[PDB]
């Protein structure tokens, strides 16, 4: 905040929602509670400048958890491979993938 | 150009009134067949 | 800089450790100028309301100077405190980080060679 | 699956109804038959000129009213909380405020028609 | 006193609707506090388990929590069964 | 942002065909920019004359864009001192005269070599020294 | 096919979004928005936000309803516009429908894309997660927390509507 | 960025309880009271280790106990359970309300034959303690080393040397 | 990023193009004003359902409640645009050019 | 699938962290029968 | 606007603004703006003239659009980061997407268009509220996000604001339009130093606020909106136009007046960051500001101007109005240079 009163008078107005790893109704965890738990206690009171370099290899692991960016890239590459030999007809899926 | 009105009130625009003209008849069931009522009304009040 | 200083308490005019600093003197020239500033507000107020600019509303002038002096005195306490705080982590960082701050063995002018520019 | 199947079936049946309605009955159009109806005589000529209705103020307030009916809709699930003391206070706030907004809307004319 | 009662009577005559709304609306705010079941209502909400009562490891010195979901020790809710 | 990055990498004067080709691009590119607002704030009347406003503005910006490259080109090789801002002194403001010629006014083009001749020079010791018009917040 | 049904529902959201953003006659734009709003309900309904879909549906019908009343009240012309009649809106119309056509082709054809962000077209079905909700719906239970966790949000929102009726009367007072 | 470890096919082989929804729900109360020790240790390991791949064996143990509970329910009180689960099954929500009569017969049957007690309402939902001998997961989240804190603040506040030191202001 | 987030983001893009690039009707402009709320509402609802952000599930309606407030006061600006100028087309209001 | 690929290490954790994550359903039902994945994702949400 | 409700008319503007400084959640920062926006419109039409309704509406579309862009910049950041806390944005376009919006909230870039336009129709009192208070909220957000703003973005938009803002001032004769372009140029002054140090932008904001406060105080007291009507005021009240000059000198920033310190401190800090060409350029361009200050002063007190005879009727009566605090702001915004070290209190 610019003029921090939430800390001063000691009453929470918006901190409860600011993150997805905070306490949720009936303990419904977020999708990436494990990552946001680790990321938050990684760069806490260490410094915003002293955060983007050291709490990095843990941060993108979280940013991947939200968006599955390179994970979906993996599926696209695999599915792209399927199209390029199924038409060529070298391989057939095992019955596990049919029934 | 023209300086703005020094009292800061623009000259009132010319009337743009567009009251409806309606003929309540001579076919309306409440017109009782032969009543040609041309009424000037704005919205729903005559 | 220092809104991110550890232990910093927002919405607190003067923190506790500020009191360890020498309080500004009453006859501090910057403080008395702030009082002189309060005086100047007195003349203008009489001037805007077209009253006797030197003898009217002496009660108004008395309030117009005391209020400036008070807010002045507290402001200078904060003024000294921040400069002292800036000088504090100043010398904390120099001692905790010797390597990045070289103390060159500076040597007198008899050993240096500064070119002389013949002016004419 | 079922929901859009239900939706598709309904629009299809309606389309056929208007289709046989609009095509079958052996039309005969002669211009004055298609002329606008004006209670027996000719139209004065407009019907797209701005029909200045007088409930404009009550119109926008209804929008504001609906914005807060959406707010007070989660009450059936809100009652199944562990903090009814807080939930009851905040719930009654909305209705008190909604009445208060109407009360100002009422007392300062407002609801009354424009003549 | 007389003015206040007359104003109520003048209201009840001129308008019966808002006075009825104001009355029953006024009650809806007050008796929730005076009700002796409101502390029971939160208990009922707390009793209903939506998530699993995840078990916790034993290390001794824990008499309160039971070791079996039939043991006498633990939070019991026979109050709600009769209620 | 690559268009002026592809101008800096080309040395001044030498490879003039590439250097001028860049100098033509950045010049005329700004023309569509200024004309875009010129059409925007100052309302045109028709599509035919609307592109005409873009016509002159793109004509000029391309022209001064082109001539700055080639006039600074010739000085860079014949004088063999590209790292000397006279190359862009006569290289830059000569376009301003043509800019005055493009608006038919040698009068304003007379005042052009006073200013374009200057600002074109100031970019050179900017290149040579560590001058930065947009300095990163180092402190 | 219904496998990319969300791919479809996303599109007609924007064709309707384009149609009313081409600035046709005000009530025609009202139709152009509601089709997008109606299909827009479908996209979020598909993802699980049943309550969110119904509320964006419900109040925007109410929102668009009051818009229509004002349009014919003091915002309509004696010669109403159509999406085809005026060439300006016609140009706006045709530009919108080829803008999506050329792009969704490009996104679907390459499935990698670069514009603004990087987009793996693949399938929106992919990012759904193997999760169980138990005997409670997250999309509805989280909103129910507004009255137990968001007291500040309730106060600020509720207050704002109150001036919302104040301003709606303040500026309409007509002297 | 590393390997993925998953126990091979032979490891996750076990016969599963092949009974349907209504059967499980009808016997759920007595199943919870009887086979809780395998349940409690399995899900405690699930929450502690936070990885099924390190808890598959406990998954084997719970299925076997679920087998034995269902095996003995077939051996002794076969018929009363059959009426119970089919009558629960008819309802569209498996509501226990429309099965009190059949439940009474099932409850007494297991009360005398297999010697069981119907768990009281709320009794089964009690949180419980499990005396598992599994070691504590030291790093359940596989957290790495954390960045060291910033250089802390110490010393006492002394007057700023030469005051403000800004431009010509001597104090 | 999937195509659903894509096509919604692109939707707000031409909503801007509709909004500021104007026409001869203020109503149709404010139509696009509440229209671009659709994209942001639908966009926002997609993430917090996707991320299982239970708390932030009230942020759409809170956003959407304030949404029509702009429209609400927007319509009231229109009426006395009409009350004093009769019509709605945005060229007669230029007396403040001076 | 990834035998003839020039560079694709089999079984590579997309995340740097070695802790197991909740597996992403997209790769769970990735190459299964199109009907199966369709029921897997939009089953409940369409069930009626 | 009914007096009692006119108070809460302004109360939610202040609290709606106050929500921006005190909140730590992006939606709340978003919420604080329309509460400011929705309640700012009616006071702009408190007089309710066709010019006022003209002035209010151009504010609305400009401000509502800016808040609309503000919303996605939150969302893209949320989509790419998943946090609502007011920190650096984690996605570059969202950053530039916000900075584009907050400028339209602020009138920095060519967006500056709406600023002089709305000031004319809205009254002097409404303008007093607009150019002063309606700038605090966007500045607070920019100061918080100052970590990850593109330096070449903020500097460019700041440079233009002082460029057009100073240059557009050399055409106007209505004091309100002149004043808005002066505010537009000062808008650029604070925002140039925004990436380097945020203490200075507060310092220049404060000096700008008190000076613009005291400035409008004089304008209401003189009850003039055209140079000729102001030119008359030498007769009725020479003190008002005499101080009109002195604060006009603080406009230009001419020392030893207060107005120099904002320009002085910013140039010092920027030079510490090795930007010397940029501060030098705005230093020259600030002369354009000073030029129409001088002409405004010239028609005010240096040279007497033709008055009327019915104005000697005015000599009999006086201002029954006051509003307190004009005497304080003239002093605070003219003689404060000997107190530069007090800027460290903001730090
Ligand atoms: C004329 C010459 C002097 C020019 C300089 C300005 C003088 C006039 C203004 C002085 C008072 C305003 C600043 C101090 C104040 O009132 O509150 C400071 C502060 C304001 O609170 P704050 O500093 O926590 O929050 C505001 C945020 N910043 C710093 C970005 C502006 O009040 C406090 O109680 C200090 C708390 C900790 C400070 C860090
Ligand atoms: C942009 C160019 C602006 C004009 C200055 C540079 C002129 C130039 O390029 O060559 C001329 C010359 C070229 O520089 P020079 O003749 O000093 O030679 C410099 C040679 N080196 C770099 C190796 C040391 O510039 C001047 O004469 C500059 C004079 C500066 C003072 C002018 C005062 C006017 C009153
Ligand atoms: C015209 C205004 C300046 C913009 C010129 C655009 C072309 C350019 O290159 O601008 C930046 C320039 C050189 O910067 P740089 O690219 O680092 O130079 C080495 C090669 N890359 O220059 C700089 O980065 C430094 C600043 C150069 C001089 C700017 C002031 C010009 C004179 C005063 C204003 C008139
Ligand atoms: C000093 C800077 C400005 C210097 C130039 C001022 C303009 C040229 C001089 C004429 C000003 C107008 C005029 O008529 O001045 C005389 C007028 C009456 O004198 P005054 O003292 O205010 O009232 C009578 C009882 N003393 O007094 C006035 O009108 C007011 C004079 C104010 C003088 C400057 C005050 C600055 C703030 C302290």
Tab-separated table of N, CA, C and O in Angstrom, chain K residues 297-333:
chain	number	residue	atom	x	y	z
K	297	UNK	N	0.741	37.779	-16.102
K	297	UNK	CA	1.128	38.780	-15.115
K	297	UNK	C	1.055	40.184	-15.698
K	297	UNK	O	0.627	41.125	-15.018
K	298	UNK	N	1.460	40.344	-16.961
K	298	UNK	CA	1.510	41.668	-17.574
K	298	UNK	C	0.135	42.317	-17.590
K	298	UNK	O	-0.012	43.504	-17.278
K	299	UNK	N	-0.887	41.551	-17.952
K	299	UNK	CA	-2.256	42.040	-17.957
K	299	UNK	C	-2.873	42.065	-16.569
K	299	UNK	O	-4.055	42.394	-16.439
K	300	UNK	N	-2.108	41.722	-15.534
K	300	UNK	CA	-2.627	41.649	-14.177
K	300	UNK	C	-2.165	42.813	-13.310
K	300	UNK	O	-2.998	43.545	-12.769
K	301	UNK	N	-0.854	43.008	-13.156
K	301	UNK	CA	-0.385	44.015	-12.212
K	301	UNK	C	0.727	44.924	-12.710
K	301	UNK	O	0.825	46.045	-12.203
K	302	UNK	N	1.563	44.509	-13.666
K	302	UNK	CA	2.614	45.408	-14.134
K	302	UNK	C	2.020	46.630	-14.812
K	302	UNK	O	2.505	47.752	-14.629
K	303	UNK	N	0.969	46.433	-15.600
K	303	UNK	CA	0.373	47.500	-16.384
K	303	UNK	C	-1.092	47.641	-16.011
K	303	UNK	O	-1.835	46.654	-16.011
K	304	UNK	N	-1.497	48.864	-15.697
K	304	UNK	CA	-2.887	49.144	-15.385
K	304	UNK	C	-3.747	48.957	-16.630
K	304	UNK	O	-3.280	49.101	-17.762
K	305	UNK	N	-5.014	48.626	-16.416
K	305	UNK	CA	-5.897	48.332	-17.531
K	305	UNK	C	-7.208	49.089	-17.391
K	305	UNK	O	-7.611	49.442	-16.278
K	306	UNK	N	-7.886	49.364	-18.505
K	306	UNK	CA	-9.117	50.167	-18.452
K	306	UNK	C	-10.194	49.503	-17.611
K	306	UNK	O	-10.603	48.369	-17.871
K	307	UNK	N	-10.657	50.224	-16.598
K	307	UNK	CA	-11.730	49.782	-15.728
K	307	UNK	C	-13.028	50.483	-16.124
K	307	UNK	O	-13.108	51.151	-17.159
K	308	UNK	N	-14.058	50.327	-15.303
K	308	UNK	CA	-15.352	50.952	-15.540
K	308	UNK	C	-15.717	51.867	-14.374
K	308	UNK	O	-14.970	52.008	-13.405
K	309	UNK	N	-16.880	52.508	-14.488
K	309	UNK	CA	-17.380	53.399	-13.448
K	309	UNK	C	-18.328	52.702	-12.486
K	309	UNK	O	-18.315	52.998	-11.287
K	310	UNK	N	-19.151	51.774	-12.980
K	310	UNK	CA	-20.034	51.022	-12.101
K	310	UNK	C	-19.258	50.139	-11.137
K	310	UNK	O	-19.840	49.624	-10.179
K	311	UNK	N	-17.964	49.937	-11.383
K	311	UNK	CA	-17.135	49.174	-10.460
K	311	UNK	C	-16.833	49.961	-9.193
K	311	UNK	O	-16.464	49.362	-8.180
K	312	UNK	N	-16.996	51.286	-9.219
K	312	UNK	CA	-16.854	52.049	-7.984
K	312	UNK	C	-18.037	51.811	-7.057
K	312	UNK	O	-17.997	52.199	-5.885
K	313	UNK	N	-19.097	51.184	-7.568
K	313	UNK	CA	-20.126	50.623	-6.701
K	313	UNK	C	-19.533	49.521	-5.833
K	313	UNK	O	-19.856	49.399	-4.646
K	314	UNK	N	-18.657	48.702	-6.426
K	314	UNK	CA	-18.050	47.584	-5.711
K	314	UNK	C	-17.202	48.051	-4.539
K	314	UNK	O	-17.070	47.326	-3.548
K	315	UNK	N	-16.610	49.245	-4.637
K	315	UNK	CA	-15.768	49.747	-3.555
K	315	UNK	C	-16.521	49.807	-2.235
K	315	UNK	O	-15.916	49.657	-1.167
K	316	UNK	N	-17.835	50.027	-2.285
K	316	UNK	CA	-18.614	50.152	-1.059
K	316	UNK	C	-18.705	48.824	-0.317
K	316	UNK	O	-18.609	48.787	0.915
K	317	UNK	N	-18.891	47.728	-1.043
K	317	UNK	CA	-19.021	46.411	-0.445
K	317	UNK	C	-17.680	45.688	-0.488
K	317	UNK	O	-16.687	46.187	-1.021
K	318	UNK	N	-17.658	44.486	0.080
K	318	UNK	CA	-16.461	43.664	0.120
K	318	UNK	C	-16.860	42.204	-0.039
K	318	UNK	O	-18.046	41.866	-0.113
K	319	UNK	N	-15.855	41.335	-0.090
K	319	UNK	CA	-16.093	39.900	-0.113
K	319	UNK	C	-16.677	39.464	1.228
K	319	UNK	O	-15.976	39.466	2.245
K	320	UNK	N	-17.955	39.087	1.241
K	320	UNK	CA	-18.442	38.319	2.375
K	320	UNK	C	-17.951	36.881	2.357
K	320	UNK	O	-18.087	36.189	3.367
K	321	UNK	N	-17.405	36.406	1.246
K	321	UNK	CA	-16.841	35.064	1.219
K	321	UNK	C	-15.400	35.069	1.714
K	321	UNK	O	-14.747	36.114	1.781
K	322	UNK	N	-14.913	33.905	2.110
K	322	UNK	CA	-13.565	33.857	2.647
K	322	UNK	C	-12.677	32.869	1.901
K	322	UNK	O	-11.651	33.227	1.321
K	323	UNK	N	-13.213	31.632	1.850
K	323	UNK	CA	-12.609	30.358	2.306
K	323	UNK	C	-11.205	30.556	2.879
K	323	UNK	O	-10.262	30.909	2.171
K	324	UNK	N	-11.132	30.397	4.205
K	324	UNK	CA	-9.901	30.152	4.933
K	324	UNK	C	-8.859	29.472	4.057
K	324	UNK	O	-9.169	28.786	3.081
K	325	UNK	N	-7.597	29.657	4.465
K	325	UNK	CA	-6.411	28.980	3.941
K	325	UNK	C	-5.739	29.586	2.720
K	325	UNK	O	-4.667	29.113	2.329
K	326	UNK	N	-6.337	30.595	2.104
K	326	UNK	CA	-5.591	31.351	1.102
K	326	UNK	C	-4.356	32.020	1.684
K	326	UNK	O	-3.283	31.920	1.064
K	327	UNK	N	-4.405	32.680	2.846
K	327	UNK	CA	-3.169	33.292	3.362
K	327	UNK	C	-2.056	32.290	3.607
K	327	UNK	O	-0.878	32.640	3.484
K	328	UNK	N	-2.394	31.048	3.956
K	328	UNK	CA	-1.361	30.059	4.238
K	328	UNK	C	-0.687	29.572	2.961
K	328	UNK	O	0.533	29.372	2.935
K	329	UNK	N	-1.461	29.373	1.894
K	329	UNK	CA	-0.902	28.779	0.685
K	329	UNK	C	-0.024	29.759	-0.082
K	329	UNK	O	0.943	29.348	-0.732
K	330	UNK	N	-0.348	31.053	-0.043
K	330	UNK	CA	0.527	32.043	-0.669
K	330	UNK	C	1.908	31.996	-0.033
K	330	UNK	O	2.933	32.002	-0.724
K	331	UNK	N	1.954	31.944	1.297
K	331	UNK	CA	3.232	31.896	1.997
K	331	UNK	C	3.934	30.568	1.751
K	331	UNK	O	5.128	30.534	1.432
K	332	UNK	N	3.208	29.458	1.886
K	332	UNK	CA	3.840	28.150	1.755
K	332	UNK	C	4.351	27.910	0.343
K	332	UNK	O	5.355	27.215	0.159
K	333	UNK	N	3.680	28.468	-0.660
K	333	UNK	CA	4.045	28.240	-2.048
K	333	UNK	C	4.869	29.369	-2.645
K	333	UNK	O	5.096	29.379	-3.858
